[PDB]
Amino acid sequence: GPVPSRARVYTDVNTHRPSEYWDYESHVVEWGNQDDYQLVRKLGRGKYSEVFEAINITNNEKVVVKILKPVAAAKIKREIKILENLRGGPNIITLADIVKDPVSRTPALVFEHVNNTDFKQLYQTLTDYDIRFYMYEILKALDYCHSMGIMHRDVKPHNVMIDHEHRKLRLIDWGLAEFYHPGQEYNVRVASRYFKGPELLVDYQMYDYSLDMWSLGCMLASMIFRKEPFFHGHDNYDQLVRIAKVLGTEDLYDYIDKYNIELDPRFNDILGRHSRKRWERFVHSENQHLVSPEALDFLDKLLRYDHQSRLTAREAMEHPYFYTVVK
Ligand SMILES: Nc1ncnc2c1ncn2[C@@H]1O[C@H](COP(=O)(O)OP(=O)(O)OP(=O)(O)O)[C@@H](O)[C@H]1O
Ligand SMILES: N#CCc1c[nH]c2ccc(C(F)(F)F)cc12
């Protein structure tokens, strides 16, 4: 069957920590006072929650309340434990409280509010310097959570809040996050389609933190090349074909061979034969201002089929692409 894999960094984190750290089922939730929060307006509704802007009436400060939809309780305790474990970490959203919603009778996660800049404005106007600056801020969040034995598994621009006025970034939406345990087989139905790593698309379950680094590369490619999304699959199968038209099919077959993966036969008629395209092929007059040899070298080291061959978040921080960023 498939050959096992383990991360090349932070494999022992959850072994060195006490069981209480990762055993989220055993965690006893400390419930706050639901009346401290007055809902102001609905901000959105996803598959797993309804999101509201609210006011903490004990300090008159804005908060965001995520009221969980009645779903599997195991997912809820996992997100709570991860948020508590990561609290105070660089650029990690702060979980301010956990209360029982009086209407839904389900948990409501209270977060610090970020006065976030409109997603479209960020995509359209962040400069070359700003992309490098904010990518460095995301790497601080990812190296932190990976160093804490957690993979985010849903890295994408809608999960990265920026209050541009205050040069403030927060990595949010930890609902798909998981503790990394070497040898564990994980569910491949994670991340948004355009950000799914090849490991997910080829149904390789023994993945790790490096999945986040692929997602980050997808985010970077779409920003610098002005191509939203960069890999535009019609479904999860066509998603792998879109990647193969850029990275080539030879390296894909080598990846499948190395990990002894049985590729879904549905791919035999759609993958075709493709050679890697040099990153310069995607440069044009409308994206030249965001492209540099350092950006292309960095992107090249994230977008690799072999999850063990990608830069880790800490190695990425050392890359020349960030030399210009004020530290
Ligand atoms: N801490 C926070 N501060 C401010 N706004 C927040 C915070 N957390 C979440 N939000 C906002 O809550 C809103 C609703 O979130 P939701 O997951 O339902 O939608 P979405 O982000 O637009 O979708 P998706 O990420 O799946 O594409 C979004 O506009 C998001 O920016
Ligand atoms: N794509 C897109 C827009 C966007 C939303 N949140 C971000 C966080 C970082 C970056 C960075 F500039 F660093 F790539 C971009 C965004």
Side-chain angles (χ1 to χ4, degrees), residues 77-111:
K77 303 201 83 170
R78 180 183 72 187
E79 182 176 358
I80 290 170
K81 195 66 174 92
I82 284 173
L83 288 165
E84 289 188 356
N85 288 352
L86 300 177
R87 190 152 57 206
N91 301 334
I92 306 303
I93 199 68
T94 298
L95 175 67
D97 213 341
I98 305 151
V99 302
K100 190 168 207 184
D101 185 75
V103 175
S104 69
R105 319 294 291 149
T106 66
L109 303 183
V110 184
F111 298 93

mmCIF file of all heavy atoms in Angstrom, residues 77-111:
data_model
loop_
_atom_site.group_PDB
_atom_site.id
_atom_site.type_symbol
_atom_site.label_atom_id
_atom_site.label_comp_id
_atom_site.label_asym_id
_atom_site.label_seq_id
_atom_site.Cartn_x
_atom_site.Cartn_y
_atom_site.Cartn_z
ATOM 1 N N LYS A 77 -14.971 20.841 20.180
ATOM 2 C CA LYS A 77 -13.957 20.766 21.233
ATOM 3 C C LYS A 77 -12.538 20.900 20.618
ATOM 4 O O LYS A 77 -11.661 21.450 21.259
ATOM 5 C CB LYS A 77 -14.044 19.434 22.002
ATOM 6 C CG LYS A 77 -15.423 19.159 22.629
ATOM 7 C CD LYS A 77 -15.344 18.140 23.775
ATOM 8 C CE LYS A 77 -14.941 18.798 25.073
ATOM 9 N NZ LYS A 77 -15.085 17.877 26.246
ATOM 10 N N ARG A 78 -12.339 20.390 19.399
ATOM 11 C CA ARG A 78 -11.031 20.469 18.734
ATOM 12 C C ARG A 78 -10.661 21.939 18.421
ATOM 13 O O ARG A 78 -9.528 22.387 18.688
ATOM 14 C CB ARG A 78 -11.031 19.586 17.483
ATOM 15 C CG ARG A 78 -9.698 19.598 16.701
ATOM 16 C CD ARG A 78 -9.806 18.771 15.440
ATOM 17 N NE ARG A 78 -10.638 19.455 14.441
ATOM 18 C CZ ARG A 78 -11.019 18.928 13.283
ATOM 19 N NH1 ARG A 78 -10.624 17.711 12.936
ATOM 20 N NH2 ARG A 78 -11.755 19.635 12.439
ATOM 21 N N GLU A 79 -11.626 22.691 17.868
ATOM 22 C CA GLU A 79 -11.381 24.093 17.549
ATOM 23 C C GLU A 79 -11.139 24.874 18.827
ATOM 24 O O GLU A 79 -10.263 25.725 18.861
ATOM 25 C CB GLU A 79 -12.559 24.681 16.773
ATOM 26 C CG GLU A 79 -12.318 26.129 16.371
ATOM 27 C CD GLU A 79 -13.414 26.733 15.526
ATOM 28 O OE1 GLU A 79 -14.383 26.013 15.193
ATOM 29 O OE2 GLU A 79 -13.278 27.921 15.158
ATOM 30 N N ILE A 80 -11.936 24.612 19.896
ATOM 31 C CA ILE A 80 -11.719 25.339 21.142
ATOM 32 C C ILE A 80 -10.307 25.105 21.708
ATOM 33 O O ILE A 80 -9.608 26.056 22.103
ATOM 34 C CB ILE A 80 -12.816 24.943 22.170
ATOM 35 C CG1 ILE A 80 -14.185 25.504 21.770
ATOM 36 C CG2 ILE A 80 -12.402 25.328 23.598
ATOM 37 C CD1 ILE A 80 -15.395 24.940 22.633
ATOM 38 N N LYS A 81 -9.889 23.827 21.746
ATOM 39 C CA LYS A 81 -8.591 23.470 22.304
ATOM 40 C C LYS A 81 -7.440 24.096 21.498
ATOM 41 O O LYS A 81 -6.515 24.655 22.075
ATOM 42 C CB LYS A 81 -8.450 21.946 22.355
ATOM 43 C CG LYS A 81 -7.290 21.519 23.245
ATOM 44 C CD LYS A 81 -7.609 21.902 24.694
ATOM 45 C CE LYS A 81 -6.589 21.381 25.652
ATOM 46 N NZ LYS A 81 -5.513 22.346 25.917
ATOM 47 N N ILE A 82 -7.568 24.079 20.183
ATOM 48 C CA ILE A 82 -6.553 24.677 19.308
ATOM 49 C C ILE A 82 -6.439 26.192 19.541
ATOM 50 O O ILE A 82 -5.329 26.714 19.697
ATOM 51 C CB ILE A 82 -6.834 24.277 17.841
ATOM 52 C CG1 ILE A 82 -6.376 22.809 17.648
ATOM 53 C CG2 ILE A 82 -6.140 25.243 16.842
ATOM 54 C CD1 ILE A 82 -6.741 22.193 16.302
ATOM 55 N N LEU A 83 -7.593 26.894 19.598
ATOM 56 C CA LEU A 83 -7.603 28.331 19.844
ATOM 57 C C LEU A 83 -7.010 28.665 21.212
ATOM 58 O O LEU A 83 -6.255 29.615 21.324
ATOM 59 C CB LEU A 83 -9.039 28.881 19.729
ATOM 60 C CG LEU A 83 -9.605 28.946 18.314
ATOM 61 C CD1 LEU A 83 -11.110 29.146 18.370
ATOM 62 C CD2 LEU A 83 -8.941 30.057 17.506
ATOM 63 N N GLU A 84 -7.305 27.851 22.241
ATOM 64 C CA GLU A 84 -6.750 28.078 23.573
ATOM 65 C C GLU A 84 -5.251 27.818 23.590
ATOM 66 O O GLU A 84 -4.491 28.614 24.159
ATOM 67 C CB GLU A 84 -7.471 27.223 24.605
ATOM 68 C CG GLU A 84 -8.872 27.752 24.820
ATOM 69 C CD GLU A 84 -9.640 27.109 25.950
ATOM 70 O OE1 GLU A 84 -9.122 26.152 26.565
ATOM 71 O OE2 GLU A 84 -10.767 27.576 26.220
ATOM 72 N N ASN A 85 -4.828 26.738 22.926
ATOM 73 C CA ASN A 85 -3.396 26.413 22.829
ATOM 74 C C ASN A 85 -2.594 27.507 22.149
ATOM 75 O O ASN A 85 -1.479 27.794 22.572
ATOM 76 C CB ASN A 85 -3.185 25.082 22.108
ATOM 77 C CG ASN A 85 -3.583 23.875 22.924
ATOM 78 O OD1 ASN A 85 -3.890 23.989 24.112
ATOM 79 N ND2 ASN A 85 -3.627 22.707 22.293
ATOM 80 N N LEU A 86 -3.156 28.114 21.082
ATOM 81 C CA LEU A 86 -2.466 29.120 20.304
ATOM 82 C C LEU A 86 -2.626 30.554 20.781
ATOM 83 O O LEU A 86 -1.997 31.444 20.215
ATOM 84 C CB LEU A 86 -2.914 29.008 18.830
ATOM 85 C CG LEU A 86 -2.640 27.676 18.153
ATOM 86 C CD1 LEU A 86 -3.184 27.673 16.726
ATOM 87 C CD2 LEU A 86 -1.135 27.353 18.167
ATOM 88 N N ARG A 87 -3.520 30.794 21.747
ATOM 89 C CA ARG A 87 -3.835 32.132 22.218
ATOM 90 C C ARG A 87 -2.579 32.916 22.628
ATOM 91 O O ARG A 87 -1.722 32.395 23.367
ATOM 92 C CB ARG A 87 -4.851 32.044 23.362
ATOM 93 C CG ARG A 87 -5.423 33.413 23.746
ATOM 94 C CD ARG A 87 -6.818 33.262 24.309
ATOM 95 N NE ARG A 87 -6.841 32.357 25.461
ATOM 96 C CZ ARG A 87 -7.898 31.648 25.846
ATOM 97 N NH1 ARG A 87 -9.035 31.711 25.163
ATOM 98 N NH2 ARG A 87 -7.820 30.852 26.901
ATOM 99 N N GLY A 88 -2.485 34.152 22.117
ATOM 100 C CA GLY A 88 -1.335 35.008 22.362
ATOM 101 C C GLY A 88 -0.194 34.832 21.375
ATOM 102 O O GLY A 88 0.762 35.613 21.410
ATOM 103 N N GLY A 89 -0.268 33.808 20.526
ATOM 104 C CA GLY A 89 0.750 33.564 19.503
ATOM 105 C C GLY A 89 0.772 34.635 18.426
ATOM 106 O O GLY A 89 -0.245 35.303 18.191
ATOM 107 N N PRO A 90 1.922 34.839 17.739
ATOM 108 C CA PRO A 90 1.983 35.898 16.715
ATOM 109 C C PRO A 90 0.968 35.744 15.606
ATOM 110 O O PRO A 90 0.898 34.714 14.932
ATOM 111 C CB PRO A 90 3.428 35.851 16.178
ATOM 112 C CG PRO A 90 4.086 34.749 16.849
ATOM 113 C CD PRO A 90 3.217 34.141 17.905
ATOM 114 N N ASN A 91 0.138 36.796 15.448
ATOM 115 C CA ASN A 91 -0.867 36.911 14.404
ATOM 116 C C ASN A 91 -1.958 35.829 14.433
ATOM 117 O O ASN A 91 -2.643 35.629 13.432
ATOM 118 C CB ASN A 91 -0.198 36.997 13.036
ATOM 119 C CG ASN A 91 0.731 38.210 12.979
ATOM 120 O OD1 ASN A 91 0.541 39.221 13.694
ATOM 121 N ND2 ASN A 91 1.784 38.111 12.202
ATOM 122 N N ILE A 92 -2.151 35.178 15.582
ATOM 123 C CA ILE A 92 -3.227 34.199 15.760
ATOM 124 C C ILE A 92 -4.438 34.975 16.312
ATOM 125 O O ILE A 92 -4.297 35.689 17.301
ATOM 126 C CB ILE A 92 -2.824 33.089 16.808
ATOM 127 C CG1 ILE A 92 -1.466 32.357 16.471
ATOM 128 C CG2 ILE A 92 -3.972 32.062 17.007
ATOM 129 C CD1 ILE A 92 -1.420 31.721 15.135
ATOM 130 N N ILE A 93 -5.627 34.779 15.729
ATOM 131 C CA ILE A 93 -6.828 35.416 16.274
ATOM 132 C C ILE A 93 -7.010 35.018 17.760
ATOM 133 O O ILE A 93 -6.786 33.854 18.127
ATOM 134 C CB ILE A 93 -8.082 35.103 15.412
ATOM 135 C CG1 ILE A 93 -9.223 36.106 15.679
ATOM 136 C CG2 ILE A 93 -8.561 33.672 15.528
ATOM 137 C CD1 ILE A 93 -8.905 37.550 15.192
ATOM 138 N N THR A 94 -7.400 36.007 18.606
ATOM 139 C CA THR A 94 -7.597 35.741 20.032
ATOM 140 C C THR A 94 -9.023 35.300 20.295
ATOM 141 O O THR A 94 -9.973 36.006 19.934
ATOM 142 C CB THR A 94 -7.247 36.988 20.872
ATOM 143 O OG1 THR A 94 -5.879 37.306 20.685
ATOM 144 C CG2 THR A 94 -7.535 36.802 22.351
ATOM 145 N N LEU A 95 -9.166 34.121 20.895
ATOM 146 C CA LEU A 95 -10.450 33.641 21.381
ATOM 147 C C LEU A 95 -10.657 34.346 22.759
ATOM 148 O O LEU A 95 -9.914 34.099 23.711
ATOM 149 C CB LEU A 95 -10.437 32.114 21.511
ATOM 150 C CG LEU A 95 -11.715 31.503 22.144
ATOM 151 C CD1 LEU A 95 -12.973 31.690 21.222
ATOM 152 C CD2 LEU A 95 -11.504 30.045 22.502
ATOM 153 N N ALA A 96 -11.600 35.276 22.819
ATOM 154 C CA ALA A 96 -11.853 36.058 24.040
ATOM 155 C C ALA A 96 -12.746 35.324 25.031
ATOM 156 O O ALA A 96 -12.599 35.520 26.239
ATOM 157 C CB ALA A 96 -12.454 37.401 23.690
ATOM 158 N N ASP A 97 -13.681 34.509 24.543
ATOM 159 C CA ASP A 97 -14.629 33.802 25.421
ATOM 160 C C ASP A 97 -15.351 32.709 24.670
ATOM 161 O O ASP A 97 -15.280 32.646 23.441
ATOM 162 C CB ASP A 97 -15.685 34.806 25.939
ATOM 163 C CG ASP A 97 -16.224 34.569 27.343
ATOM 164 O OD1 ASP A 97 -16.096 33.441 27.852
ATOM 165 O OD2 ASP A 97 -16.763 35.517 27.927
ATOM 166 N N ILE A 98 -16.015 31.830 25.416
ATOM 167 C CA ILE A 98 -16.847 30.742 24.947
ATOM 168 C C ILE A 98 -18.102 30.842 25.803
ATOM 169 O O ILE A 98 -18.008 30.858 27.039
ATOM 170 C CB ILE A 98 -16.180 29.350 25.107
ATOM 171 C CG1 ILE A 98 -14.794 29.296 24.428
ATOM 172 C CG2 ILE A 98 -17.097 28.235 24.561
ATOM 173 C CD1 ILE A 98 -13.839 28.290 25.120
ATOM 174 N N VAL A 99 -19.268 30.969 25.144
ATOM 175 C CA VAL A 99 -20.559 31.069 25.862
ATOM 176 C C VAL A 99 -21.570 30.129 25.191
ATOM 177 O O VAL A 99 -21.350 29.692 24.064
ATOM 178 C CB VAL A 99 -21.078 32.545 25.922
ATOM 179 C CG1 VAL A 99 -20.063 33.478 26.589
ATOM 180 C CG2 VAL A 99 -21.471 33.080 24.530
ATOM 181 N N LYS A 100 -22.647 29.766 25.899
ATOM 182 C CA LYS A 100 -23.703 28.928 25.328
ATOM 183 C C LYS A 100 -24.709 29.927 24.743
ATOM 184 O O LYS A 100 -25.220 30.781 25.479
ATOM 185 C CB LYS A 100 -24.376 28.088 26.447
ATOM 186 C CG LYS A 100 -25.322 27.002 25.934
ATOM 187 C CD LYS A 100 -25.721 26.037 27.049
ATOM 188 C CE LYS A 100 -26.075 24.671 26.515
ATOM 189 N NZ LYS A 100 -26.564 23.768 27.592
ATOM 190 N N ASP A 101 -24.972 29.860 23.426
ATOM 191 C CA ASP A 101 -25.942 30.771 22.826
ATOM 192 C C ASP A 101 -27.367 30.446 23.335
ATOM 193 O O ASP A 101 -27.815 29.293 23.264
ATOM 194 C CB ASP A 101 -25.904 30.731 21.302
ATOM 195 C CG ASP A 101 -26.846 31.779 20.727
ATOM 196 O OD1 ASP A 101 -26.490 32.968 20.764
ATOM 197 O OD2 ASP A 101 -27.963 31.403 20.270
ATOM 198 N N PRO A 102 -28.094 31.466 23.847
ATOM 199 C CA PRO A 102 -29.448 31.205 24.389
ATOM 200 C C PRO A 102 -30.477 30.722 23.376
ATOM 201 O O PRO A 102 -31.451 30.087 23.777
ATOM 202 C CB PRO A 102 -29.846 32.562 24.980
ATOM 203 C CG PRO A 102 -29.036 33.554 24.260
ATOM 204 C CD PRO A 102 -27.711 32.872 24.039
ATOM 205 N N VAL A 103 -30.279 31.028 22.088
ATOM 206 C CA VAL A 103 -31.231 30.662 21.052
ATOM 207 C C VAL A 103 -30.910 29.299 20.449
ATOM 208 O O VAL A 103 -31.761 28.401 20.478
ATOM 209 C CB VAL A 103 -31.368 31.789 19.995
ATOM 210 C CG1 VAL A 103 -32.275 31.374 18.826
ATOM 211 C CG2 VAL A 103 -31.874 33.088 20.650
ATOM 212 N N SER A 104 -29.675 29.133 19.925
ATOM 213 C CA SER A 104 -29.270 27.882 19.278
ATOM 214 C C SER A 104 -29.024 26.733 20.292
ATOM 215 O O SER A 104 -29.092 25.557 19.920
ATOM 216 C CB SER A 104 -28.002 28.133 18.469
ATOM 217 O OG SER A 104 -26.922 28.373 19.355
ATOM 218 N N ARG A 105 -28.680 27.084 21.539
ATOM 219 C CA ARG A 105 -28.300 26.179 22.638
ATOM 220 C C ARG A 105 -27.018 25.401 22.266
ATOM 221 O O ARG A 105 -26.826 24.236 22.644
ATOM 222 C CB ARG A 105 -29.462 25.259 23.125
ATOM 223 C CG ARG A 105 -30.848 25.928 23.244
ATOM 224 C CD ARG A 105 -30.929 27.000 24.329
ATOM 225 N NE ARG A 105 -30.843 26.459 25.690
ATOM 226 C CZ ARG A 105 -30.323 27.112 26.726
ATOM 227 N NH1 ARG A 105 -29.819 28.331 26.568
ATOM 228 N NH2 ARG A 105 -30.292 26.547 27.925
ATOM 229 N N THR A 106 -26.167 26.061 21.466
ATOM 230 C CA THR A 106 -24.881 25.538 21.026
ATOM 231 C C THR A 106 -23.784 26.515 21.448
ATOM 232 O O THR A 106 -24.092 27.686 21.746
ATOM 233 C CB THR A 106 -24.845 25.381 19.492
ATOM 234 O OG1 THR A 106 -24.911 26.679 18.907
ATOM 235 C CG2 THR A 106 -25.918 24.450 18.951
ATOM 236 N N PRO A 107 -22.483 26.104 21.394
ATOM 237 C CA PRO A 107 -21.425 27.041 21.781
ATOM 238 C C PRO A 107 -21.287 28.202 20.817
ATOM 239 O O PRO A 107 -21.504 28.059 19.607
ATOM 240 C CB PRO A 107 -20.150 26.173 21.803
ATOM 241 C CG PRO A 107 -20.648 24.758 21.828
ATOM 242 C CD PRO A 107 -21.924 24.779 21.046
ATOM 243 N N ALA A 108 -20.958 29.359 21.374
ATOM 244 C CA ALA A 108 -20.691 30.573 20.627
ATOM 245 C C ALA A 108 -19.288 31.048 20.995
ATOM 246 O O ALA A 108 -19.013 31.362 22.154
ATOM 247 C CB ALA A 108 -21.726 31.644 20.932
ATOM 248 N N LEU A 109 -18.382 31.025 20.010
ATOM 249 C CA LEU A 109 -16.999 31.451 20.213
ATOM 250 C C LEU A 109 -16.914 32.955 20.019
ATOM 251 O O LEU A 109 -17.366 33.492 19.001
ATOM 252 C CB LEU A 109 -16.063 30.701 19.224
ATOM 253 C CG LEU A 109 -16.098 29.173 19.269
ATOM 254 C CD1 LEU A 109 -15.087 28.574 18.301
ATOM 255 C CD2 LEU A 109 -15.853 28.629 20.666
ATOM 256 N N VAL A 110 -16.375 33.653 21.015
ATOM 257 C CA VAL A 110 -16.228 35.092 20.972
ATOM 258 C C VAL A 110 -14.773 35.406 20.647
ATOM 259 O O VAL A 110 -13.890 35.004 21.406
ATOM 260 C CB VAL A 110 -16.690 35.729 22.302
ATOM 261 C CG1 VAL A 110 -16.637 37.255 22.230
ATOM 262 C CG2 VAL A 110 -18.104 35.256 22.651
ATOM 263 N N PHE A 111 -14.537 36.154 19.566
ATOM 264 C CA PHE A 111 -13.188 36.536 19.116
ATOM 265 C C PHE A 111 -12.932 38.024 19.205
ATOM 266 O O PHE A 111 -13.861 38.831 19.072
ATOM 267 C CB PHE A 111 -12.993 36.149 17.628
ATOM 268 C CG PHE A 111 -13.087 34.679 17.368
ATOM 269 C CD1 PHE A 111 -14.296 34.096 17.007
ATOM 270 C CD2 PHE A 111 -11.958 33.866 17.458
ATOM 271 C CE1 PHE A 111 -14.394 32.718 16.791
ATOM 272 C CE2 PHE A 111 -12.048 32.498 17.204
ATOM 273 C CZ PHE A 111 -13.264 31.922 16.883
#
